[PDB]
Design a protein around this ligand. Sequence first.
Ligand code: HEM
Ligand code: HEM
Ligand SMILES: C[C@H](O)[C@H](O)[C@H]1CNc2nc(N)[nH]c(=O)c2N1
Ligand SMILES: C[C@H](O)[C@H](O)[C@H]1CNc2nc(N)[nH]c(=O)c2N1
Ligand SMILES: [Zn+2]
Lengths: 414, 416
Amino acid sequence: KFPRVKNWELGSITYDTLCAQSQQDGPCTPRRCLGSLVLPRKLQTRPSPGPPPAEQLLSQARDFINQYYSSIKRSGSQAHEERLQEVEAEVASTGTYHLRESELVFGAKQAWRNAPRCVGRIQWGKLQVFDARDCSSAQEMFTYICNHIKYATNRGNLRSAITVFPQRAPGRGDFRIWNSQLVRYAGYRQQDGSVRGDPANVEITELCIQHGWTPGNGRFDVLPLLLQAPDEAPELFVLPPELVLEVPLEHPTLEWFAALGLRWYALPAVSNMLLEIGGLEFSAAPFSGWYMSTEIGTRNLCDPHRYNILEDVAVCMDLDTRTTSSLWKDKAAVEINLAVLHSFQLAKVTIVDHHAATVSFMKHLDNEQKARGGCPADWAWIVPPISGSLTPVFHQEMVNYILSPAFRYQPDPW
Amino acid sequence: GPKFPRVKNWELGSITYDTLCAQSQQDGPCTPRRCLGSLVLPRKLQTRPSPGPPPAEQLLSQARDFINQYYSSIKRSGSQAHEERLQEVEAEVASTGTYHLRESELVFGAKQAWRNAPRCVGRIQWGKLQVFDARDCSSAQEMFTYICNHIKYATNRGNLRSAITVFPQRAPGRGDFRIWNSQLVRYAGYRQQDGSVRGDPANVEITELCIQHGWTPGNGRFDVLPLLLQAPDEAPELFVLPPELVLEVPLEHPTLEWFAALGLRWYALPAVSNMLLEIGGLEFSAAPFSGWYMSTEIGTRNLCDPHRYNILEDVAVCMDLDTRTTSSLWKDKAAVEINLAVLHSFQLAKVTIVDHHAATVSFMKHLDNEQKARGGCPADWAWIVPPISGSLTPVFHQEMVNYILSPAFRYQPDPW
Ligand code: HEM
Ligand code: HEM
Ligand SMILES: C[C@H](O)[C@H](O)[C@H]1CNc2nc(N)[nH]c(=O)c2N1
Ligand SMILES: C[C@H](O)[C@H](O)[C@H]1CNc2nc(N)[nH]c(=O)c2N1
Ligand SMILES: [Zn+2]
């Protein structure tokens, strides 16, 4: 009933009992495992043709309120009893309900804690939660967002934060941020099929232009935001450059690296996921932390479908690009990740390397085994994209499952 | 759309549907409530020992399914030979509780077991396998002869050739044929007074089993072990492989002159010998198989795992790296040079080896072939993606569907 979980480096064994608290089904079955798929349409939180059934909603809300009071140890207080009755009252008459701010703050931190793809969860207790539920216009969202970013960047001393915009309502369209992150580089599909900039952002770049943006022509042009208030066309907002802290990439010993003209932005802020707490859904709730260097040095700069700089750097290093067996790719990638760490350190911008980060996740796993009898984790996302078995999490068996509060994928608004 | 897993490649943006998983008849460890995909041995890929003969009715369904597979493969499904073969199997089981495979059925089943292996990145080679039929073997000393012949054929002086040797199947009223060793070539692991280990820590128990069975130990880092071989109902017997049959490669580096002085080496032939070959419900408890190495198996896992030869810090020190901080990427730097040494050394010695870029590129081609041939390919992402340079290889960006197809290579309990 409970998985036996082994760490093959240390020989230690634990049992995951927390997984019995899952109530949402993942994509696997006993007949085939789909653990490596990025998004099955299933766990995804898509639009609906009306208001959720009140029984389901109140089951999730009761469990959540139950989590909250257990969390402040008044589980069973009259406050508890009373809050449950308010929630019951509000659902039965309106089909929905509202969270108290302190509940929202607990719920956002628990959603991060529960995120099986996040290797940075040892920080989960440390999150600035901005309540933006009194927002009624795109213009307003922009102001809250600009405030998120100033707070979170903090001159390079990054601090984790989330801004929560108004929940989804049966009666209307959603508040959405169309960009997948608050900071994104444009991707221009020049004539010859090519792409200048970040190919991951060709479609959003196109939407921006189509919605009146005047495009640049560089490899790192920061896109404007497309922000959407319920049932209205999204509106275009250009971020103040002063708010977007960037790091030009240099290498500690290769002189010519700086000449590649490469850079990346300081703040990782995901803006297209849905935050679910107690059955309520926040379709606009951007969150940010700081980067793990492999995100930049390895995936964003060396993926074949991204900036794909591996061969340029190898040729620069005078590597033998003729055969696979010279390991030119491996060698170039190491230096590019080294350049990322060097540059952030030099610019005094928070960053964490993949060894430090996975070591801290191992400690986090230990903490959560004690605290809750397990930790949901997605092995393929937790092991880094370089040097996998050189890190401790490679040798660690992991159990993956969905707990709520949760961050979830949702359909693109367009 | 289709009622099958939709599978995407994120580098290429292409999509496929896996229909082959429909054929899966054995349940894995995952459920809608939680995924156990990252577990090495869930109790869903391991075959416990049958002290008793499998129930006739369970055996026959498994047998009929495999015989249908065989006749489909030679495109005589529904045929008179087909119906006749089925009948014969039902009679054999019907009177003796078991049955036996024709030679060409064994060859098909063995190649199919490899094709069906979700954790193997080398399956593009699956059609090319020398199948040694050793089902006449009747003693521990004969197994030894069969195995030496295997090694000589497979090794072929450095031009390696895939091969498997099949010993008699599990039989009701009879103990099992077993090779106690996990591979045909294993370096000794000697526990030290300090509690440390000299040699390969993965092999401590077998090293001690050998000793306990009368082997006289050495005290090197790379002492080849003797084979513990077991014929039915007999205690296992100790056999020493003549040195000349075990080809080894001393490791050197193409530009780092001092690396040779490290005195490192690895053997040329990867030959797994403790897995169970299952065909049509029949169980071959001893059926060693071999291919050639992918360089990361040696350079990354065997040499750099913390619980294996653990040489990262040694090599980093020689490269004069800052081993006192993580963000110098000293582990990453050293690993790369250790893997390059392995490739360089195997090439120089003209022993077959495949780097992890070439191997995963070839696996992508296999996935394409198999989509067409069978509408899918069961694959264990965590094992297929290499332990270094993961997203620098094509398989990282390919979603995969994992399931159990039979004929199969299965884990089985230790014989002791
Ligand atoms: C404090 C620093 C943190 C670090 C170093 C960090 C690290 C990571 C990494 C390496 C990933 C993978 C990203 C990718 O491959 O695209 C990620 C995923 C994730 N992080 Fe964290 N994390 C941290 C903070 C945050 C915070 C503040 C939250 C939420 C409140 C967050 C929630 C998540 C979620 C939901 C995912 C999955 C994203 C997806 O599915 O695309 N993390 N994090
Ligand atoms: C021709 C060369 C081949 C290549 C390069 C190759 C490569 C690999 C690799 C890298 C693994 C992972 C090993 C590990 O991490 O411990 C593996 C596993 C596997 N291979 Fe292949 N393979 C080859 C041939 C063979 C052949 C000939 C067979 C069988 C007929 C075989 C059957 C398997 C099986 C069943 C596994 C899984 C074993 C386990 O769970 O420990 N492979 N192979
Ligand atoms: C197909 C496969 O799941 C996909 O490439 C995953 C693998 N692991 C990953 N891990 C992280 N952290 N981020 C990713 O985007 C991915 N992509
Ligand atoms: C815990 C985890 O499943 C384990 O370390 C796996 C990961 N991937 C692997 N991949 C290969 N090829 N070989 C292995 O031994 C493993 N070990
Ligand atoms: Zn699974």
